[PDB]
Amino acid sequence: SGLTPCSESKGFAKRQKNEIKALTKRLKQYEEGSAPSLALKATIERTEKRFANYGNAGLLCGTDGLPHLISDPGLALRFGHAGETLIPTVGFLYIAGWIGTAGRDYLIASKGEAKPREKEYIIDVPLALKISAQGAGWPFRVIRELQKGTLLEKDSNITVSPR
Amino acid sequence: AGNWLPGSDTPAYLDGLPGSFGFDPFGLGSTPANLQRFQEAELVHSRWAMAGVAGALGAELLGQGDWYQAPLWAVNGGAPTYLGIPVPFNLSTLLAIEFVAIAGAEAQRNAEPDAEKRKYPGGAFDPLGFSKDSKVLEENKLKELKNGRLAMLAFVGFIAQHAATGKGPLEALKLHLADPWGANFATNGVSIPYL
């Protein structure tokens, strides 16, 4: 996209220099070893480490000197940008399927009790913890339920409004 | 006749058809009216490819250039030549009689009411009487489709080879025979794009 790597971008280096300069300008009003001086020094160290880490990660910077993420799985894989969107996509989808499968399993387990509505606002905490730990293996069980036809309710068993 | 994937269930509507190996994994022939249309379409594609492959290969064996090197006299300002004999036609008259001859033949083919003669017309198209015996005709129907399916893959094999390497069909066969383990579809930068 016409971008340049942040490790060689002049705007990136200028932004790091300006942020460090502003923090150092704030730093000179306090005595050495005081709590504000230590806090500002820790902020300066974090700023330097962050700019170094963003430069070392292969991030691409625009004309504004700011990192730009690449989200097409093709351009990310062939140019080393998969850690920006693609691997976070896989991680989020795994965790989201975990949460959804744990909720579905808890709802289905509570459906079989004598008071199904009771477990929805007074949580069965041991059962919820057991079901929550079992959500790690959600893709296998979910894909099997999809192949078996047990994941979906039949259309004849679901209420609809008159058309 | 067999199974394209041994040990697998084949669709029931494909049983008894000529050249049938139970291959319809997408279920395109599930509709009976579509399956009848696809049977004529497969045979017409087969017969055009069988003549097309023999025309493309047979002209090279007679030293008249490859199938790709045929029509550039239209764009290079040249003249047509059949076996060295000049042909006194231009593109304004070659396509005109092509539209008249082909669409005239295709209009007669489309007008047949019954399903069998839309695939196997016979009559004037079978002067040597190969359809006199039912046993020979049924076996020849399997022979036609199996040869036709090979020619359909060969002509697409002509196009895909030339779009990837730029060489001729017999040129690529010579290249493959000269070094098989280093000259194939894998060794060009087109078929597998990420090496």
Next chain:
Amino acid sequence: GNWLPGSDTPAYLDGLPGSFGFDPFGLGSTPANLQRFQEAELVHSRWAMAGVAGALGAELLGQDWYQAPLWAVNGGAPTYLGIPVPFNLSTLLAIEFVAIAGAEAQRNAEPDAEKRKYPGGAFDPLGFSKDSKVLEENKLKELKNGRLAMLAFVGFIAQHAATGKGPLEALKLHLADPWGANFATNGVSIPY
């Protein structure tokens, strides 16, 4: 006989000509497959007679079998025995196709089953055949004599793949150096 004494032979291999009960993988379990494999074995064995008798007989007449088709690629003319021989390599494959494919097409056109394996009639000069008592005896002789012949021809190819030399001279190296020259000494058959 038995290929492995004490082992239980398959029941479907009993009564066959040249039968030793050797089918550990059950390839001839289906009778339709078994019938075709006998014709495949006999044709492979009979062609192995011609290959060995040829390779060995020609070099007993001073004519290597590997060096025989070495006048077309490098350059030269075909030669049989000592007579200057006509035709060319391009013409040789034309007569190769018409003679063999014309003969092989008649090999399987018959509706019989024994005739595909054991033709008889016009294919048995000098009498032979007769009723049963010597026909089955040379039926056993044909498969066993054929079996070394295809083992030897594969041995002819494999030796030249490992040593690059002929089989007759490599036999002489096996008598000159019986313990220092075999398939174990060269670094091709057994690496390291």
Next chain:
Amino acid sequence: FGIGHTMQEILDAHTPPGGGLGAGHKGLFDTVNNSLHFQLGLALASVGTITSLVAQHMYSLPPYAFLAQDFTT
């Protein structure tokens, strides 16, 4: 004049034989033709989409002389 298409026949013919669209577009000629609100909805959908197209194409491909320099316009 005896030549041309009939829209009812076009609509009735366009039903996929696999049954994916059910009866297809059968009876839709009488639905569209007898309903002024169907016709008004189709006309407004197309006209509003065309109005958006006009907006998107006059700024980027200005058709009038000295229009691109008139920023307020």
Next chain:
Amino acid sequence: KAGNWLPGSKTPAYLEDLPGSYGFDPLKLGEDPASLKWYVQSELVHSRFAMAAVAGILIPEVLKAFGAVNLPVWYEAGKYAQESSPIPFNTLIALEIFAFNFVEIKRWQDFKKPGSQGEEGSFVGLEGFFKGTGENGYPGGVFDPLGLSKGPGYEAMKLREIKNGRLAMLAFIGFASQYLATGKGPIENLLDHLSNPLANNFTTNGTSLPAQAHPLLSVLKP
């Protein structure tokens, strides 16, 4: 059942009669019977692949440590083999894709319909090679040429294959992680651990315990 992975726990009932079963399924992945059959086949295939791989890594490495042979190490053996390979990289990949497509489709079709690859017409005359033993993951035929599945110790060999398979899978993942963390070979890692097991382990490779996640590593040190 071979035992209990957690003594005192309630083992699942669907893992009672499986070979190599210790009742280990806390995630309940094999609760569905079709899933259990598919995962039995998957564990066997993974086990045999890891078995052969760990053999082809460890036996050359042990022979090199004893000084018998001098072969390239496993993480670099692809480089030295490809330079002396008559067949280049792309056609090797294409040939592997073709061959594995064929053999894995045959294995998959036998899994879906047991014994189907041994019927008449399944192969071009050679279907007797693959008649099957009627068991999930135990093909036989050419794959058992010595015929020791008909022996009395067939059930013990099934247990031996599965346990050695799990050991081999853990061993290969150990080889990969040990290279990625230490940068050296597996026998080198073993000898470093045997020289000083307190100081040479995963807690000192600088990778397995990240410094940011474990601030006490830099604090509680001499």
Next chain:
Amino acid sequence: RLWCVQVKVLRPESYWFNEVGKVVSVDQSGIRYPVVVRFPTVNYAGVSTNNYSLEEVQEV
């Protein structure tokens, strides 16, 4: 039609259309909607029972 038998409601304007309820009682005096059905869910009015005709309920 029986007592405490699962039935599926076929009345389209009903809140429990295509849903399964339990038969409470069936009136035998020939009224228009004799089948009394109890449902595990309430409708928008908070009611859990409704009366249906013979053709409006299918035994499941």
